[PDB]
Ligand binder design. Structure first.
Ligand SMILES: *O[C@H]1[C@@H](OC)[C@H](n2cnc3c(=O)[nH]c(N)nc32)O[C@@H]1COP(=O)(O)OP(=O)(O)OP(=O)(O)OC[C@H]1O[C@@H]([n+]2cn(C)c3c(=O)[nH]c(N)nc32)[C@H](O)[C@@H]1O
Ligand SMILES: [Mg+2]
Lengths: 14, 734, 50
RNA sequence: AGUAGUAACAAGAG
RNA sequence: CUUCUGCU
RNA sequence: AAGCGAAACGCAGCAGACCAGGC
């Protein structure tokens, strides 16, 4: 059930 | 092929051979700029002086075979002389003109494709629309704005990766394209740059311009989008605004952001009105975003936001009741909460004022790669169930949930160099800074969050700080579901007169109290078309225009204040200003100012034009009697509480007596006409509630007193009080 | 290296208006001065030395 | 002479 | 003399 | 929301006697 996330302003963790 | 022949020839020469053999590729970067010519320290004079000599330009030695040494008039186009420090010959500007006149022509269909950044400007200016020019008191605030929007789906690295791959496919190196966007752009550029003889450096520079995002600090008054910043000089002036609508399509994110800012300003302004629903409907029908009426935009753009949804409910559309936070769409399924500012100390000793939410609440978070069910209380995460598709997604969702919790254990987990104020010293959103910091590094937060035992439940698996799942231990109130979590749906709602949205069962879904208090800036310029054209402007503009309106209508305002002040206070022109006065102190300030005006009217004479102009906007809200004495009145401006001093001049509100001019926040508001009825005669009567300022102290009635201590006086007695900027004055209690 | 260290330190100092430039400098100065004037007590006389 | 002003120019290097 | 130069 | 230099790499056993001791 792939879904979007509307507004977003984040990058990937490490 | 001739490059190898040139290399052989260079090898033949002794000095050149030694240079080529000894200098490594690493050393090339240093010898590449090894010159004797020092940078001109006065280029204008040198250019003006050199244009007079015969051969000021330098051209490639090849020109000698491409241009005759002299034209039909005998003027020498070039000279056999060699430029000092290179093989370029020295030529006159006649050579440039001759080349442009009858030089070798070539096809130029590639230029619009390679210079797309420059040609798009012309293309969008050609289709631009110009509205009326309105003269106003423009208040341009300095902030960072977009010069080159770049590509929204590519970062610096992604842009360079495409650039290199498109311009220098062989020199790409070990880098590899890893995104559908990068592949599509690379394919399109390669298809467009077929048989392009333009210098590769220019192609790379133009591609960098078009792709890498660039921002600069500019004094803006309208939209901050690139389509608007480029024409900033034409649109926003010092005393006028030119309604302009740039051609082409606009980014959906810019429209969504602009709509959010406009809706938030509209609800914040309509909340202090007598009929909030009617005011909101009128504002929404009059407002336009980038030349498009907000009325028709709300019916096509969801932009889930505590203000957008409200506006939609007012308009009758079905709302989403959802808000986006950290890339996750949160839907409050149950519970309610109330905002309140709280002072906290982070792990790096910084102190912040975060908007803590009180009350138990339950949310559903939907993300591009995760979905979670969250249940939180006041600064505490009760439970969280994540259903992310990937381990990285699980980590991202958990970090967002922890930051959203606002738990003290997370605030204390902040470590290293984290700044809550930018280089311009502006106050950033603490939640966003925390989210960014913890997404950059979450090891410390996971280590300090805490661990709890797991109740064995089918389908629920715990997760440990090292990200490996466990069945016996897990992070405090954290579970991972492998079966998925359920879904977006719009529910019709009813909105009452006071903008309190309720569902079919009467449960209140949205209220104006939860709308964000941050006064942001719109990406796309917002235009208002009512008599009070500054109704939905920012704080500084609202203050300056409010006082300007008061001064312009002073000949009537004075009569109304002297005759029917109760009806004057209810004038709609003061409602936007009331939007900036704190909600808690609104009634106190209104009651205090109303009493001060009444006492000034009772005491014959003592009329003070400057005091009336300064305090009139604070009387609009309903009175709330109190014994409190205010030395200054606070108004919110972009998160800062500006203090207006009741007595005297302050930088926020100043009256220059020499020029008889009023300045608000440094912006001129107008001149005050000479009033024969003023007659101050020393006594003020408008500084303290129930007390008259007699004048200079005399060291007889008392050494000194405080503003609150003055309440001890019963009646008639005179005493010295220290009121204002260290100015002790004699006062009398009625 | 010494200038790089000083620049890194100055970026964290509110009163240091050197590393920034252009409108960014004017914005920093306006914000800083504004806050300084604000936090000042209403009963305290204020003066500016230039 | 003049420019100009704390020291130059009023050509200089072959 | 002629050659070279007007930021070196 | 933000933003600067605007190749190649987890051992191993005697066994068989006899004695003393353990519940
Ligand atoms: O860039 C701005 C904003 O544009 C104005 C933009 N933005 C929001 N939504 C969208 C969108 O859908 N599409 C686009 N393109 N842009 C969008 O996001 C930025 C937000 O900036 P800012 O105004 O500083 O954020 P703000 O609105 O003030 O608050 P924020 O921190 O993001 O919080 C968002 C909502 O979450 C509420 N909230 C936070 N917490 C911790 C809680 C909580 O614990 N309980 C409840 N009930 N609510 C919480 C915030 O109050 C706010 O309502
Ligand atoms: Mg036994």
């Amino acid at each position: 059930a792939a879904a979007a996330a509307a507004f977003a302003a984040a990058a990937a963790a490490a | 092929m001739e490059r190898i022949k040139e290399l052989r020839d260079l090898m033949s020469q002794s000095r050149t051979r030694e240079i080529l053999t000894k200098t490594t590729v690493d050393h090339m970067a240093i010898i590449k700029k090894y010159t004797s010519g020092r940078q001109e320290k006065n280029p204008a004079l040198r250019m003006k002086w050199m244009m007079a000599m015969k051969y000021p330009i330098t051209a490639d030695k090849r020109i000698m075979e491409m241009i005759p040494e002299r034209n039909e008039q005998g003027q020498t186009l070039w000279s056999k002389t060699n430029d000092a420090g290179s093989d370029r010959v020295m030529v006159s500007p006649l050579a440039v003109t001759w080349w442009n006149r009858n030089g070798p022509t070539t096809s130029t269909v590639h230029y619009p494709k390679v210079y797309k950044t420059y040609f798009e400007k012309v293309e969008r200016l050609k289709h631009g629309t110009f509205g009326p020019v309105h003269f106003r008191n423009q208040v341009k605030i300095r902030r960072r704005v977009d010069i080159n929007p770049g590509h929204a789906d590519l970062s610096a690295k992604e842009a360079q990766d495409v650039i290199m791959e498109v311009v220098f496919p062989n020199e790409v190196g070990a880098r590899i394209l890893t995104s559908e966007s990068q592949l599509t752009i690379t394919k399109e550029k390669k298809k467009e740059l077929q048989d392009c003889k333009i210098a590769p450096l220019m192609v790379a520079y133009m591609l960098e311009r078009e792709l890498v995002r660039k921002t600069r600090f500019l004094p803006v008054a309208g939209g901050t989008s690139s389509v608007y910043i480029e024409v900033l000089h034409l649109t926003q002036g010092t005393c006028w605004e030119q309604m302009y609508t740039p051609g082409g399509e606009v980014r959906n994110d810019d429209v969504d952001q602009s709509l959010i800012i406009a809706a938030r300003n509209i609800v914040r302004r309509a909340t202090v009105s007598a009929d909030p629903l009617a005011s909101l409907l009128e504002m929404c029908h009059s407002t336009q975003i980038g030349g498009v009426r907000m009325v028709d935009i709300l019916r096509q753009n969801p932009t889930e936001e505590q203000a957008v949804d409200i506006c939609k409910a007012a308009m009758g559309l079905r709302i989403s009741s959802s808000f986006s936070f950290g890339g996750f769409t949160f839907k409050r399924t149950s519970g309610s909460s109330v905002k309140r500012e709280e002072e906290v100390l982070t792990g790096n000793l910084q102190t912040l004022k975060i908007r803590v939410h009180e009350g138990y609440e339950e949310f559903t978070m939907v993300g591009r790669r995760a979905t979670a069910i969250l249940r939180k209380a006041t600064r505490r995460l009760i439970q969280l169930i994540v259903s992310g598709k990937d381990e990285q997604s699980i980590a991202e969702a958990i970090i967002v949930a922890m930051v959203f919790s606002q738990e003290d254990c997370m605030i204390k987990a902040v470590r290293g160099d984290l700044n809550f104020v930018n280089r311009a010293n502006q106050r950033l959103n603490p939640m966003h800074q925390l989210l960014r910091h913890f997404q950059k590094d979450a090891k410390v937060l996971f280590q300090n969050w805490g661990i709890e035992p797991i109740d064995n439940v089918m389908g629920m698996i715990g997760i440990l700080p090292d990200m490996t799942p466990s069945t016996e231990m897990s992070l405090r109130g954290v579970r991972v579901s492998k079966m998925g979590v359920d879904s977006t749906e719009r529910v019709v709602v009813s909105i009452d007169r006071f903008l309190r949205v309720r569902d079919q069962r009467g449960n209140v879904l949205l209220s104006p109290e939860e709308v964000s208090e941050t006064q942001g800036t719109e990406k796309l310029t917002i235009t208002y078309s009512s008599s009070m054209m500054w109704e939905i402007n920012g704080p500084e503009s609202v203050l300056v225009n409010t006082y300007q309106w008061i001064i312009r209508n002073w000949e009537n305002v004075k009569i109304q204040w002297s005759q029917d002040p109760t009806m004057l206070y209810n004038k709609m022109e003061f409602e936007p200003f009331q939007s900036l006065v704190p909600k808690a102190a609104r009634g106190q300030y209104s009651g205090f100012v109303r009493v001060l005006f009444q006492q000034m009217r009772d005491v014959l004479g003592t009329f003070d034009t400057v005091q009336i102009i300064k305090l009139l906007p604070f009387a609009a809200a309903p009175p709330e009697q109190s014994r409190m004495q205010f030395s200054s009145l606070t108004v919110n401006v972009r998160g800062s509480g500006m203090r207006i001093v009741v007595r005297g001049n302050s930088p926020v509100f100043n009256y220059n007596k020499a020029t008889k001019r009023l300045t608000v926040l440094g912006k001129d508001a107008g001149a005050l006409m000479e009033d024969p009825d003023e007659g101050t005669a020393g006594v003020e009567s408008a500084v303290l509630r129930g007390f008259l300022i007699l004048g200079k102290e005399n060291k007889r009635y008392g050494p000194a007193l405080s503003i609150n201590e003055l309440s001890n006086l019963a009646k008639g007695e005179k005493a010295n009080v220290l009121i204002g900027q260290g100015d002790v004055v004699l006062v009398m209690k009625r | 290296f010494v200038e790089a260290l000083a620049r890194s330190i100055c970026e964290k100092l509110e009163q240091s208006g050197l590393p920034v430039g252009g409108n960014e400098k004017k914005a920093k100065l306006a914000n800083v001065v504004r806050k300084m004037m604000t936090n000042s007590q209403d009963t305290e006389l204020s003066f500016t030395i230039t």
